[PDB]
Amino acid sequence: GAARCEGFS
Amino acid sequence: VKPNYALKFTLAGHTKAVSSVKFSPNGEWLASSSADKLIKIWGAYDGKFEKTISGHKLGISDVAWSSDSNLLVSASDDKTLKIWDVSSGKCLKTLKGHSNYVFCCNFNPQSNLIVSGSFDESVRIWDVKTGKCLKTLPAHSDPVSAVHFNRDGSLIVSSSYDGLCRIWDTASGQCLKTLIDDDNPPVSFVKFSPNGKYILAATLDNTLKLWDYSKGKCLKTYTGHKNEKYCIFANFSVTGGKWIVSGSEDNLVYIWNLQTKEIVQKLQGHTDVVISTACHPTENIIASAALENDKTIKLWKSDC
């Protein structure tokens, strides 16, 4: 995927 | 006065979450990047699909245009950036040297340099012509969420999950300023204003803030949207009224009056988080893009 599309968890 | 943005086109074709959309400086094109590892080019006025640009090995978090609208740079989880010739689709250079995901990227106004930010907590400055890394700045202590050059390229602003915005001298790499307010939420986005006087910073406490970075003073705050998790782009809209535009985690586009800070419009229709918005350089047009459960880009037009 892409880090931006995952968000900060 | 309030805008009247209305949905005109919905652009489908990315097979995973969109990550960023950007209008070309000449107004002709929209570029979009996605977790599906692809860049797509669309007509800015009709939303007509133009082409797909491929070659990254993992998803793309950001894409940006050169000032003459001829080149793109993309930032990928594959820890590279890529410089593309849009007309030919060629990958001109692969910029290698970050040790973790590359999250954000921009050309300088001359478009002879690229600035990048990464999960490796560094900011890097690259030569466009050779693809070589010129400088690595030990900028932050957490992932770098945004990087942007000022009006003449003399300065770089960076933002990070570490809660800081920093201003860097492009030539020397010195840290000229650190900006942070009374609370320390992660900073998820930053950019200079069109006139270069201000920076607009997003934090993951549902807040946008307009700063005079020279004086180090927070001048305006914009609230009412939801932003606690994602690095959502924000924009200055200057073609008609002077607005602030942002995506939101309640699936809406928010538009604020820049001076009064009142919400003046909310655009409804995406089915997931609006991760990215862009404002057309000459027409009252907004592009918006949403995450995995939506996968679409929408074009909205207003009379002011």
Numbering used by the authors:
A (entry chain C): 40 to 48
B (entry chain A): 31 to 334
Lines quoted from the article behind this entry:
Two separate and non-overlapping sites located on opposite surfaces of WDR5 mediate most of its interactions with binding partners: an arginine-bearing cavity located on the surface known as the WDR5-interacting (WIN) site, and a shallow cleft on the opposite side referred to as the WDR5-binding (WBM) site. In mice, methyl-CpG binding domain 3 isoform C (MBD3C) interacts specifically with the histone H3 binding protein WD repeat-containing protein 5 (WDR5) and forms the WDR5-MBD3C/Norde complex.
Although a new water molecule is introduced into the vicinity of WDR5 Cys261, it does not have the ability to generate a hydrogen bond with WDR5 Tyr191. Taken together, these data collectively indicated that both MBD3C Phe47 and the residues connecting MBD3C Arg43 and Phe47 are crucial for its interaction with the WDR5 B site.
